Amino acid sequence: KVFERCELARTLKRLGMDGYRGISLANWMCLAKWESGYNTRATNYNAGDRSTDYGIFQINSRYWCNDGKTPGAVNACHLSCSALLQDNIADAVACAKRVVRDPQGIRAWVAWRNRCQNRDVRQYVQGCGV
Ligand SMILES: CC(=O)N[C@@H]1[C@@H](O)[C@H](O[C@@H]2O[C@H](CO)[C@@H](O[C@@H]3O[C@H](CO)[C@@H](O[C@@H]4O[C@H](CO)[C@@H](O)[C@H](O)[C@H]4NC(C)=O)[C@H](O)[C@H]3NC(C)=O)[C@H](O)[C@H]2NC(C)=O)[C@@H](CO)O[C@H]1O
Ligand SMILES: [Cl-]
Numbered sequence: 001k002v003f004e005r006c007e008l009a010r011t012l013k014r015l016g017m018d019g020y021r022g023i024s025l026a027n028w029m030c031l032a033k034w035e036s037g038y039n040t041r042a043t044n045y046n047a048g049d050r051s052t053d054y055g056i057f058q059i060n061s062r063y064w065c066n067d068g069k070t071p072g073a074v075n076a077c078h079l080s081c082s083a084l085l086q087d088n089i090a091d092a093v094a095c096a097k098r099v100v101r102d103p104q105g106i107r108a109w110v111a112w113r114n115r116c117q118n119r120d121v122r123q124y125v126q127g128c129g130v
């Protein structure tokens with residue numbers, strides 16, 4: 001499913017992402033926007049290292065979910081990567097929360113550094129009622 005901006009912001013707020021491990025809701029919104037355009041079925045194969053990025057947050061198979069075909073991978077979220085392609089984002093959110101419990105936090109996504117860090121991210125949540 002492709003979420004509408006404010007529909008996603010309200011969903012993420014109900015799922016407890018606002019301020020999770022110090023990350024504001026607008027930062028999560030900025031990340032989803034640049035990673036997948038708010039699309040849960042998005043996938044990106046990284047031919048250079050044989051891993052795949054899955055779902056609305058483009059979570060990588062080398063560390064976070066199991067797809068079976070990525071060499072030397074682990075599955076820290078304890079999920080099949082298929083779980084990250086559902087229209088319901090509860091599993092993807094639980095996984096994203098796990099990602100930021102590691103030391104890099106939100107920096108785990110290079111798109112966040114390029115597109116969101118030190119920017120005015122209020123634009124992503126303006127007028128959504130969150
Ligand atoms: C070419 C390209 O840009 N590909 C993109 C992917 O790079 C990108 O996904 C991110 O990939 C990075 C790079 O490896 C990955 O970072 C690693 O994350 C693990 C897990 O947190 C780290 O390992 C942990 O380190 C701490 C430090 O002590 C330990 O506490 C813990 O035991 C370690 N766990 C493991 C399993 O090793 C690595 O240190 C870290 N490596 C580096 C170099 O920083 C990110 O997690 C990936 N991010 C996500 C969200 O999956 C992907 C994201 O969209 O985009 C591809 O296109
Ligand atoms: Cl699963």
Ligand SMILES: [Cl-]
Nearest residue numbers: 066079080081
């Ligand atoms: Cl699995």
